[PDB]
Ligand SMILES: Cc1cccn2c(=O)c3cc(C(=O)NCc4cccnc4)c(N)nc3nc12
């Protein structure tokens with residue numbers, strides 16, 4: 008089956024209200040930039056962002072011109088003429104609306120509280136989807152806390168129920184309405200809901216892992232924001248998952264969550280595969296179409312893993328626009344993020360940037376030796392490794408933020424489509440390198456193992472292996488007379 | 503209030519059936535050896551052992567002569583003439599009956615399994631108590647496994663209900679009927695039920711910790727069977743409590759259960775006090791009135807921490823009686839166990855034994871240089887440090903196995919009674935030494951702390967400390983926007 012290619016289309020309310028396809032100073036990325044060829048290379052477009060209002064219903068920004076919004080959506084749905092598989096999802100949430108201190112966070116928490124709130128919220132999602140012509144619902148709550156997770160589960164299940172209903176009602180079995188979420192791509196936020204991944208993912212068609220922003224100016228050491236594999240020379244991080252409410256023993260937590268660890272794309276994926284009931288076909292790897300830039304960096308390792316002087320405040324404090332060649336930074340008033348489109352133009356614009364390659368992380372980076380700058384980003388080369396990863400691990404596909412940040416020819420999107428689908432591409436010899444893999448073992452990736460059946464009344468020594476009720480168990484100490492499962496003395500090590 | 507002093511009177515069935523007080527070759531320790539003085543030094547005698555029959559009721563061994571049994575028990579209860587505080591408990595279980603592999607083990611499993619089985623078993627206990635004139639019920643199931651624990655507790659609760667009713671029905675307000683159990687004194691067995699210690703001890707007057715047999719010939723290195731504190735030079739053990747069914751986080755398991763650790767009496771006591779709802783005044787420290795002997799030991803440290811050639815299976819599987827001077831070893835066909843009485847005569851008898859002292863563990867040991875022998879045991883000296891520990895830790899008192907192993911003068915009993923109740927004994931400057939204490943910190947022994955109150959809406963840095971809902975909390979990583987108790991980021995550290 009065809010791998011998912013899920014690209015966000017983000018447009019702020021002011022750009023909707025003043026939508027034009029002929030003035031890049033008003034709308035930098037009009038829907039017209041999404042050509043038929045590009046429409047054939049996507050499977051989903053995540054239109055974004057809608058919100059949840061104080062009435063606890065799915066809603067557009069109250070400032071939205073409803074006619075201008077419908078017109079933007081129509082331009083997106085017209086693209087389905089070029090691709091019968093294409094879906095225009097819409098996204099509820101995002102960081103600004105839905106983080107703990109965001110403007111609407113309480114409406115997310117309160118919408119999922121009761122069966123009545125959940126039914127009201129869920130019905131509003133389907134009503135919105137139908138009123139505007141969307142093909143599915145994407146929820147980007149960043150992120151439900153432990154006590155909110157069950158309500159969030161039930162809210163998803165309720166949307167699932169109404170979406171399947173609407174599919175039968177509209178006779179859409181050939182392209183059924185879908186439900187997805189944006190999931191945390193790093194252990195710290197993932198720890199909030201990790202223990203309930205199985206029930207979170209069960210009503211989803213996909214969970215799109217936000218496997219980017221794994222580095223940034225808020226950390227004191229420069230790093231790759233989306234390393235596939237780990238680099239022993241790079242910084243390592245506390246494995247927050249070892250503190251999630253899993254109820255596991257010490258040996259179980261220790262062998263699932265080595266700490267410190269390399270905060271990589273592969274870590275986030277394996278961490279999802281470690282839980283029982285999380286199918287790899289539903290995991291979608293996120294990739295960034297932008298880079299993050301640091302100032303004040305020391306040479307030696309090309310700016311990698313170096314101290315830096317980049318502010319972490321939002322918004323950017325000063326007017327020091329120090330990313331040389333980033334005209335787009337001036338428009339947006341921030342030198343710390345630059346679209347791939349813009350970084351490509353910096354590389355070919357003779358500005359003093361050197362493109363380097365880390366063969367552990369399998370990602371590019373820019374070092375500005377004169378100005379002491381470092382940029383972590385992704386490109387068509389790094390997408391080669393991530394695509395082969397997606398194929399090797401049988402993931403559902405790829406997600407990226409966002410369409411507007413690709414270059415004018417859509418090379419990043421075309422690359423992703425190519426690596427999955429082109430007869431003229433062959434990655435069978437692509438060498439995935441020797442970067443650090445995430446080797447945690449959990450209930451969802453226990454190996455098949457073979458051991459004598461458990462004999463009741465036997466006294467087992469330490470390390471003995473025994474087969475019992477569908478698992479292979481190992482003793483942690485000696486003189487074991489208890490049965491496996493029933494006792495602190497046995498470790499489940501295989502199936 | 504008086505510390506408990508709980509002595510086991512153990513008499514096998516055949517000594518009952520042939521009971522006499524005029525032939526130490528039939529009955530080595532008849533009840534007449536408990537003089538009025540020694541009765542005054544006891545607060546409880548645990549008559550042992552009764553069982554649970556296949557009808558899932560408390561019962562004597564079927565082979566018991568019931569007339570002879572009533573006479574032995576009447577002799578023990580007559581002792582109450584000399585001590586109105588004295589209680590003749592009876593004990594259900596013991597290792598032989600109730601261990602995983604013991605002859606009656608399934609009866610213990612089945613007795614507690616259902617409401618009707620527990621009601622029937624609890625009634626049988628109170629009927630046995632009243633019919634024979636006992637003052638309370640002590641249950642030595644060694645040991646219930648995790649899945650069995652809730653049923654065990656309900657049964658203990660059910661016994662508590664009947665016993666409290668029976669107290670009122672019998673006018674025994676001044677000496678209420680009591681309920682105790684013998685609990686594990688070592689982490690391995692303790693890990694079976696550790697997580698439910700609170701509800702296990704709640705219906706009990708006392709939990710009698712079997713803080714002995716912590717060394718023995720089943721272990722590859724000779725060691726002290728009842729070290730008060732640890733010796734860095736001694737062996738260390740896997741801390742099985744970190745695998746108990748606690749549901750705590752990795753950090754919580756780690757700071758509570760250092761591993762490996764020194765298997766000591768202090769470890770067991772602190773391990774009980776680490777759990778919430780386990781009051782120190784219900785914790786009783788077991789001590790041994792016998793010693794454990796090893797052969798094939800090497801010099802260099804008086805036989806301590808040496809490899810050895812002692813068989814570990816039971817029964818002793820040879821007729822080689824190598825504990826020289828040990829008369830009763832021959833009588834009992836086992837050179838691996840000697841009563842304190844026998845050990846003292848060996849020390850008096852010129853047999854080549856040197857009495858040595860470990861000032862870290864605060865326990866004596868014998869070294870036999872000629873024959874390569876090592877004996878771990880306890881005496882009136884080690885009992886000073888332990889009695890002072892009992893007072894300083896505000897424990898309930900002391901328990902011991904068993905009365906028939908004291909010397910004919912009752913020196914061990916008298917020593918215990920002296921250290922608790924003699925007006926002219928002063929241990930205020932008894933040096934408790936620099937042996938290793940158990941450092942684990944858990945929910946029932948958190949340090950009192952202060953910290954600024956948690957303020958919702960605040961974003962906390964890593965390592966920040968706040969007070970909230972009665973506790974002081976620390977963030978384990980940075981950018982924390984959630985409240986303590988609602989997030990994996992907050993670690994309970996205090997108050
Ligand atoms: C201050 C801060 C602290 C911790 C995490 N933070 C974020 O994780 C974050 C994320 C975004 C963001 O927009 N990521 C792109 C995206 C794509 C699709 C769906 N949802 C989000 C943002 N602007 N600020 C963010 N600040 C923070």
Ligand SMILES: Cc1cccn2c(=O)c3cc(C(=O)NCc4cccnc4)c(N)nc3nc12
Pocket residue numbers: 486510596597598642684712715720814816903
């Ligand atoms: C083979 C073995 C391995 C590990 C520990 N082992 C014991 O810890 C133990 C303990 C006893 C025992 O009887 N202790 C006396 C007692 C006092 C009060 C209440 N209940 C029992 C026994 N006979 N064999 C025992 N074998 C073992």
Ligand SMILES: Cc1cccn2c(=O)c3cc(C(=O)NCc4cccnc4)c(N)nc3nc12
Pocket residue numbers: 220221223225226319961962963964979980981982
């Ligand atoms: C994913 C992401 C996207 C955009 C901005 N982002 C942040 O601005 C950020 C900031 C922090 C952070 O730690 N900021 C200050 C601080 C340091 C130490 C203790 N307390 C607060 C963090 N951990 N993740 C962060 N992720 C993001």
